[PDB]
Amino acid sequence: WERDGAPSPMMPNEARLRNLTYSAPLYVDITKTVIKEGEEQLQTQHQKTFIGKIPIMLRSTYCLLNGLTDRDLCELNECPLDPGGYFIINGSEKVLIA
Amino acid sequence: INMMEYLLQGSVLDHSLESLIHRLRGLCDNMEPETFLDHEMVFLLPFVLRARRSMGAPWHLRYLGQPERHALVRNCVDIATSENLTDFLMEMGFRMDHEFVAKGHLFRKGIMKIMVYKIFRILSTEALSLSYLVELSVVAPAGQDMVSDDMKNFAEQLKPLVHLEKI
Amino acid sequence: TCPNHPDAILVEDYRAGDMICPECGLVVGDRVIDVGSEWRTTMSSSDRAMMNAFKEITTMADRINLPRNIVDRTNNLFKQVYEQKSLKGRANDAIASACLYIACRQEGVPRTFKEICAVSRISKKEIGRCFKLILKALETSVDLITTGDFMSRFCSNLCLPKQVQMAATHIARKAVELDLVPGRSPISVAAAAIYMASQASAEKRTQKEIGDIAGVADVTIRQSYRLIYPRAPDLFPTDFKFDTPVDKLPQL
Amino acid sequence: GRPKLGGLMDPRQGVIERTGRCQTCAGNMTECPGHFGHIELAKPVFHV
Amino acid sequence: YARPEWMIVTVLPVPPLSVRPAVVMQGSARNQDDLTHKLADIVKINNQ
Amino acid sequence: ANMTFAEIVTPFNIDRLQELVRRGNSQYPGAKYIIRDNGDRIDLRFHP
Amino acid sequence: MIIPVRCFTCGKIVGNKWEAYLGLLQAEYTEGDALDALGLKRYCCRRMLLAHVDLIEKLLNYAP
Amino acid sequence: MIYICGECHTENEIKSRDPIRCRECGYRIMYKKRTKRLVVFDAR
Amino acid sequence: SYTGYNQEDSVIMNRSAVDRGFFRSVFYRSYKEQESKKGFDQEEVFEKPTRETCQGMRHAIYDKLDDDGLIAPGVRVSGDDVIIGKTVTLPTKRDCSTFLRTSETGIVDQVMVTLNQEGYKFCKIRVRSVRIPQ
Amino acid sequence: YNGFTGRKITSQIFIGPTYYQRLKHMVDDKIHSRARGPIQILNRQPMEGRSRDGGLRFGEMERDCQIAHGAAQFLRERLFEASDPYQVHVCNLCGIMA
Numbered sequence A: 001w002e003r004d005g006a007p008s009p010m011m012p013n014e015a016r017l018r019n020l021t022y023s024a025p026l027y028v029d030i031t032k033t034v035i036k037e038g039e040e041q042l043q044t045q046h047q048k049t050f051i052g053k054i055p056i057m058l059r060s061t062y063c064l065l066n067g068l069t070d071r072d073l074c075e076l077n078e079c080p081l082d083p084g085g086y087f088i089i090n091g092s093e094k095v096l097i098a
Numbered sequence B: 001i002n003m004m005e006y007l008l009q010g011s012v013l014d015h016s017l018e019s020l021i022h023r024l025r026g027l028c029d030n031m032e033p034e035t036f037l038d039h040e041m042v043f044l045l046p047f048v049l050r051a052r053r054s055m056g057a058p059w060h061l062r063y064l065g066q067p068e069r070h071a072l073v074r075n076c077v078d079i080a081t082s083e084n085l086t087d088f089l090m091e092m093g094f095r096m097d098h099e100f101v102a103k104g105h106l107f108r109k110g111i112m113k114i115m116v117y118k119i120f121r122i123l124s125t126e127a128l129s130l131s132y133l134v135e136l137s138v139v140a141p142a143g144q145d146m147v148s149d150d151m152k153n154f155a156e157q158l159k160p161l162v163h164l165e166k167i
Numbered sequence C: 001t002c003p004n005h006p007d008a009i010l011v012e013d014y015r016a017g018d019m020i021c022p023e024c025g026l027v028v029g030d031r032v033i034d035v036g037s038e039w040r041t042t043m044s045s046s047d048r049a050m051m052n053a054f055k056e057i058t059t060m061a062d063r064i065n066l067p068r069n070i071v072d073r074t075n076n077l078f079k080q081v082y083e084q085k086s087l088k089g090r091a092n093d094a095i096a097s098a099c100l101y102i103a104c105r106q107e108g109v110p111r112t113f114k115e116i117c118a119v120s121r122i123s124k125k126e127i128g129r130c131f132k133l134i135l136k137a138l139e140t141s142v143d144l145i146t147t148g149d150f151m152s153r154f155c156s157n158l159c160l161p162k163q164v165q166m167a168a169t170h171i172a173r174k175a176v177e178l179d180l181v182p183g184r185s186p187i188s189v190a191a192a193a194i195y196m197a198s199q200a201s202a203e204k205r206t207q208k209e210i211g212d213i214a215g216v217a218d219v220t221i222r223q224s225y226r227l228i229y230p231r232a233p234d235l236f237p238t239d240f241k242f243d244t245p246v247d248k249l250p251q252l
Numbered sequence D: 001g002r003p004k005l006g007g008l009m010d011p012r013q014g015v016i017e018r019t020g021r022c023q024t025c026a027g028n029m030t031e032c033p034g035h036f037g038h039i040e041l042a043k044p045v046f047h048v
Numbered sequence E: 001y002a003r004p005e006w007m008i009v010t011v012l013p014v015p016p017l018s019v020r021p022a023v024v025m026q027g028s029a030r031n032q033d034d035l036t037h038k039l040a041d042i043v044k045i046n047n048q
Numbered sequence F: 001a002n003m004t005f006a007e008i009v010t011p012f013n014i015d016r017l018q019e020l021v022r023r024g025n026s027q028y029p030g031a032k033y034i035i036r037d038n039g040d041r042i043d044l045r046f047h048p
Numbered sequence G: 001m002i003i004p005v006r007c008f009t010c011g012k013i014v015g016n017k018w019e020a021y022l023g024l025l026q027a028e029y030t031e032g033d034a035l036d037a038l039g040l041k042r043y044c045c046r047r048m049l050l051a052h053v054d055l056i057e058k059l060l061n062y063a064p
Numbered sequence H: 001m002i003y004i005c006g007e008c009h010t011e012n013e014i015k016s017r018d019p020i021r022c023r024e025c026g027y028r029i030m031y032k033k034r035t036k037r038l039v040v041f042d043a044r
Numbered sequence I: 001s002y003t004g005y006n007q008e009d010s011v012i013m014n015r016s017a018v019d020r021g022f023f024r025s026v027f028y029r030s031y032k033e034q035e036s037k038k039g040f041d042q043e044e045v046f047e048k049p050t051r052e053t054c055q056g057m058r059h060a061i062y063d064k065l066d067d068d069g070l071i072a073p074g075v076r077v078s079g080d081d082v083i084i085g086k087t088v089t090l091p092t093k094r095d096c097s098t099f100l101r102t103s104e105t106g107i108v109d110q111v112m113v114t115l116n117q118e119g120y121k122f123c124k125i126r127v128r129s130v131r132i133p134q
Numbered sequence J: 001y002n003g004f005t006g007r008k009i010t011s012q013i014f015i016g017p018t019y020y021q022r023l024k025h026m027v028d029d030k031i032h033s034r035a036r037g038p039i040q041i042l043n044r045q046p047m048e049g050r051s052r053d054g055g056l057r058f059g060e061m062e063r064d065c066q067i068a069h070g071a072a073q074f075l076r077e078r079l080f081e082a083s084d085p086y087q088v089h090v091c092n093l094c095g096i097m098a
């Protein structure tokens, strides 16, 4: 999200350069049912309530560089040989050691 | 090379002087002192400058900085200049506020100099003060405490007639 | 403070951390400069309330993904207002929301009062009142909002193309210049311009959609759009690819 | 905004700023070893 | 050299500035040492 | 060049140390500081 | 990244033979036969072409 | 003060007060253009 | 065992080969500097300071920096050189500029300016230094 | 053949192509010296400033080595004169200084 509030896809190279966190918004469907004791219950469903952001491992199924051909990666300034498998937190490539 | 002076002043009554001149002449080494008549000015742009003419020597000007021990010392750079300086400093932009001629006699020493004189105000010479003034101006590059100490001994010799201190 | 040099500026040194007279080289101070720092190479009630306000500000900012710089400006504004204490009678939550709005305005990415209310439990009326009081207390001012301020966010949330966003921005700016919408709120004018551009482009958005994102009633959008509709060809950019011709734009 | 006598940053106790000298021993930051102060306790206090 | 009564704290020594020198951070914001903060605490409590 | 050894000036080495001082810190071998009998330190590069 | 101008060992000009070497490989020459045709007799020179990796070709795929 | 957009490679003048952003691209990563001052390299 | 200079896990290298680029390398070092307007009146701004405007500065020359306080690419930088000129307003403005490693002596490779995750302006400067085997 | 003289080397050398690697450890990044450099605030002891001139730690093992050597003057120099020399005025009657 830019300072003006306009969302835009975040490329991993952009995250690395701008010290951003490669994270994906997370939404939950939440059903709230209120029983007033008046013999009627009101059920309202909030669709896709934002609950936070999850850092995304690069080259995973949920990364922007998923299923992209080597030419597309080159156009995005990403090494096709780069295996991914790490997270970009504040622009720092973090790898989770097993 | 720049030198800062050691000077400190005092005044002497008229009747007193007749004893002082003989006192100073005998005490220090010299022959037949000279009466020095000079016409001094002061120039302000703050950078107070003093240009002195003496009645065929060239116009000698001197600057004294702000004072920096038993002595009064301020950085001084004295430079001899040829004639037609006054108009030169007019084209500089300096302005002359007052000018006074000084009359009297000066006696020397190994390094230090004694000059006894009275300040004359100009309009036409008038005696600003009835008593002369005496100082012990000493010029020495890279001033050190040793030079100032020697003045203390000499001043103590002259203490009885006139007691002088820096101001 | 070179002893032989009255009023001498001593140059700092990084090799030894000392200040040295430049004209003689005398070392005044041995290791006095501390090059390591010089060269960069039980809680009180008031403080607890301030901390709670900061936490609320961070929550509200993250709700709409506001940057940490705006958050910090909001924190500073809240500190100033809270210590000034002219708003001590007002809720800390309302003060925080108004400070967040003022911080957005000062940073040049204003959010509508409705947008701030959507993330704050405080109502729009209370937020506006606290905003006025905060402006008076700070003796400062905020630049008047313009239609172009909200175009980026509104178009991005509506997922409109960049060309459509440019067309909407140009339409709103030209309408304001021509004075076709006197007194109308900038948000309403921007919503009407966005509706015009969307209807003239392939990506068509309903009045309800635009009102939902912009915080403006479809009726208000209708009024503004009706005011700008007669001169739509004049308002539209010259090099705009009209999927729907300007003549055939919806009339309402 | 200036050192005050009887305060924690007492100028007597030593040098405050690097380009300064304390009033007690007239020594700069490097030369001055620092001088102790004292606090009178209205009630005697145990030593841990 | 050591009297038992001296073990009780009646006058509290105050370390010189050199022991607990004031630090500068974020410009000219003088960051007083932990010793300075504690000495402020004892000073306030003693005055009270 | 960074490291230095303080040699005491003697008539035996007066000329050699004078030459080293003249060379100064700029060109190795040279000197970095001169300490007078007063104990004061003079920076050669600052004062050429 | 790019073929060295000179053989590191003996200094023979080797920077003008990369394109010809690739052309021979396309023309179905074995690597040794292509090196012999190019005239690289010393194994020090043959190593230059045999072990070279032309990363510049892929580096050019990124827009300037 | 000329800056090159990191996406579209467009030069644009930018002052010390205005925000750093491409004039037409909208891209927020900028690269300073190479200095006019000429640097000498020994071909060693 | 040619001359004994390769003894005890040591190596003798061909100077001519090294001259011909043998095992020659680049060392890229990236410096990141952010300007933060955090504080009541404590703001940081990228700009080339002046020896008199700021509360205090250094003998290091600031001529390398540009009007924006950033060193342009292609400029040789050695020790005691300012690559980023920052000023933090005093609660004058104190000099908050950043220097390089004294040993390091390279050329400014790439200077980029952007907004970090916090929205504050910051610059990343990549300095390139050529390491010939020695 | 010997390069200096051109004479055949009596033993026949084993020479051939081998794959070598240049490690990141360069002497340029490791060389550092300290000679009358900056010191910290409280300890008045050496600390690296604007360079790699933080000095070297004269540890307990080095202290014991110099003790075994018997170089008392050098040990005193290293621990006192080189690190943080200092002098204080102390009263003879009462040991506490003033």
Ligand SMILES: [Zn+2]
Residues within 6 Å of the ligand: C002, C004, C005, C008, C021, C022, C023, C024, C025, C026
């Ligand atoms: Zn000096």
Ligand SMILES: [Zn+2]
Residues within 6 Å of the ligand: D013, D014, D015, D022, D023, D024, D025, D026, D027, D032, D033, D034, D035
């Ligand atoms: Zn003291």
Ligand SMILES: [Zn+2]
Residues within 6 Å of the ligand: G007, G008, G009, G010, G011, G012, G042, G043, G044, G045, G046
């Ligand atoms: Zn070869």
Ligand SMILES: [Zn+2]
Residues within 6 Å of the ligand: H005, H006, H007, H008, H009, H010, H022, H024, H025, H026, H027
């Ligand atoms: Zn662009």
Ligand SMILES: [Zn+2]
Residues within 6 Å of the ligand: J091, J092, J093, J094, J095
């Ligand atoms: Zn005693």
